[PDB]
Design a protein around this ligand. Structure first.
Ligand code: MG
Length: 571
């Protein structure tokens, strides 16, 4: 029986003197078992003996100090097994999921200790988790920048903050495990709950594993959320607008849209209506010109290093090569002018509208009938399922090693690939999601300012007539009027500012209307802008070029990781 602990470290902030000055572990199941010390050597000695599963919140940080220690004490990275070595799962983008430490076997059973990231099961900060789950949290925090030399004695106050931090996580994981959510990720917890509802027998039949090439072709037709800013209102500031958000976007498409399942049938040329294979992805070749008065639809995203959804308005001379779901293709034909269209071939799929209703009915009920902890978990169950279908291909990741200067280094690991769940599903759930947002914005073309996956920003404060019949404060899939603003400024995608009418507070602040309001709250939304930097944004300050050296960023140094301030700039 594998024990489970909730751990944490407290470290120094000096680049030249980076080290762990306090640690702590608590038994997720028995919160009476726990220890707080000031020696990493002492913690690691325990780690090697415990033969259990440990969780750190945001392993990307703690894991650096851990690997640093292992590498200095006879441990080397090893792709799989081999006594006195450790394996890892760090993604190409630097996301840490696991540190497996092996010490050999004994009587044909291996002796080890695996470390995981609790941030993958509960994707929020500790404080937030404390508030939302109704967990006792100590007011304030350690003086993160107080001198702590070798030999430092943890004071009784600091001692309670460490115990509290690890206890908050310990209570959350426990509640989560007592609810049957016993996975490494929240995403996998959803898939388990889903598979538990339709059987691993029906699952396997409904979501077969496609060939490597067949999966790659499907992936060609996958896109993310629709995030677009009207060039017209670009950078210039405006006044008086409204914002509409879809009530649970993804669970809504999954609830009643025609979704794919089963083995695809390959066809040549243009798709012909097939009652049994209602859905399809078509490989087409053409040239196009966005029509006058229509929003761009054909996108290109996630490029080489940095993204920022780019929407083409024309092929401009060159014949384009595209793979589109029938949902995306239908929108393309309306918004653009297509030239010399050549249908090459595609994929047909069986489809149904009832694969997710039971799973969604079950957890939406629990969500509506619960509070705090159980309620946040219900939301996680409902929100993390979509992600499992629109998952990635190769598991190629970063492999650590210790450099001569004492700090960690990383190199690309050998190629490595896993198995898709069912790519066709992720393609169509996002397509319908985009179709929902796009058609609504296009219907309000005259007043449209901005779009971001599940929301639309319009000028004016009056609900458009064409949207009236699909607006609702709580109904699944309906557009909920989320706020009205007196003025705003949009610099770029996901980069805007608004003055929101905030209804008088009868004890607590809410969104108000231009008639019934009390406060005018200023809110900022920006790419990598911290709450510290946001508290310096002003309407004539907010513009491309804005910068400030207050954005902390991790840096591998001997010892482990340290946070340094790096210039954040709105470009
Ligand atoms: Mg603390």
């Amino acid at each position: 029986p594998r024990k489970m602990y909730s751990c944490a470290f407290e470290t120094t902030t000096k680049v030249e003197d980076c080290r762990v000055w306090a640690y702590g572990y608590m038994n997720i199941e028995d919160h009476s078992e726990y220890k707080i010390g000031n020696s990493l050597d002492e913690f690691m000695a325990w780690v090697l003996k415990v033969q259990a599963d440990l969780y750190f919140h945001n392993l990307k940080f703690a894991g650096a100090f851990i690997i640093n220690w292992l590498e200095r004490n006879g441990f080397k990275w090893s792709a799989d097994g081999l006594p006195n070595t450790y394996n890892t799962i760090i993604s190409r983008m630097g996301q840490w999921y696991m540190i497996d430490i092996c010490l050999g076997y004994k009587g044909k059973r291996k002796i080890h200790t695996v470390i995981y990231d609790s941030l993958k099961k509960l994707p929020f900060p500790v404080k937030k988790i404390a508030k939302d789950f109704k967990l006792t949290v100590l007011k304030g925090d350690i003086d993160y920048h107080k001198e702590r030399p070798v030999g430092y004695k943890i004071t009784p106050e600091e001692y309670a903050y460490i115990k509290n931090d690890i206890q908050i996580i310990a209570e959350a994981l426990l509640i989560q495990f007592k609810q049957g959510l016993d996975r490494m990720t929240a995403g996998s917890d959803s898939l388990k709950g889903f598979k538990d509802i339709i059987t691993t027998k029906k699952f396997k039949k409904v979501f077969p594993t496609l060939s490597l090439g067949l999966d790659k072709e499907v992936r060609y037709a996958y896109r993310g959320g629709f995030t677009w800013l009207n060039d017209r209102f670009k950078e210039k500031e405006i006044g008086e607008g409204m914002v509409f958000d879809v009530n649970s976007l993804y669970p809504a498409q999954m609830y009643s849209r025609l979704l794919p399942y089963g083995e695809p049938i390959v066809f040549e040329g243009k798709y012909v209506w097939d009652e049994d294979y209602p859905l399809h992805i078509q490989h087409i070749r053409c040239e196009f010109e966005l029509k006058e008065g229509y929003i761009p639809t054909i996108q290109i995203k996630r490029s080489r290093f940095y993204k920022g959804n780019e929407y083409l308005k024309s092929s401009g001379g060159e014949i384009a090569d595209l793979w589109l779901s029938n949902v995306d293709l239908e929108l393309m034909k309306e918004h653009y002018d297509l030239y010399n269209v050549e249908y090459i071939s595609g994929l047909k799929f069986k489809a149904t509208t009832g694969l997710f209703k039971d799973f969604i009915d079950k957890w939406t009920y629990i969500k509506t009938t619960s509070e705090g902890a159980i309620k946040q978990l219900a939301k996680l169950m409902l929100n993390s399922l979509y992600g499992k279908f629109a998952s990635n291909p190769d598991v190629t990741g970063k492999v650590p090693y210790l450099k001569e200067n004492g700090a960690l280094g990383f190199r690309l690991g050998e190629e490595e690939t896993k198995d898709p769940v069912y790519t066709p599903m992720g393609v169509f759930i996002t397509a319908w999601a985009r179709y929902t947002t796009i058609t609504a914005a296009q219907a309000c073309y005259d007043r449209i300012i901005y779009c971001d996956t599940d929301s639309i920003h319009l000028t004016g404060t009056e609900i458009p007539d064409v949207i009236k019949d699909i607006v609702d404060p709580k109904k699944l899939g309906y557009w909920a009027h989320e706020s009205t603003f007196k003025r705003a400024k949009y610099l770029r995608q996901k980069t805007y500012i608004q003055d929101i009418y905030m209804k008088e507070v009868d004890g607590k602040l809410v969104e108000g209307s231009p008639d019934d309001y009390t406060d005018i709250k200023f809110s900022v939304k920006c790419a990598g802008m911290t709450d510290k930097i946001k508290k310096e944004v002003t309407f004539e300050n907010f513009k491309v070029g804005f910068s400030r050296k207050m954005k902390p960023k991790p840096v591998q140094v001997p010892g482990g990781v340290v946070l340094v301030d790096d210039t954040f700039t709105i470009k």
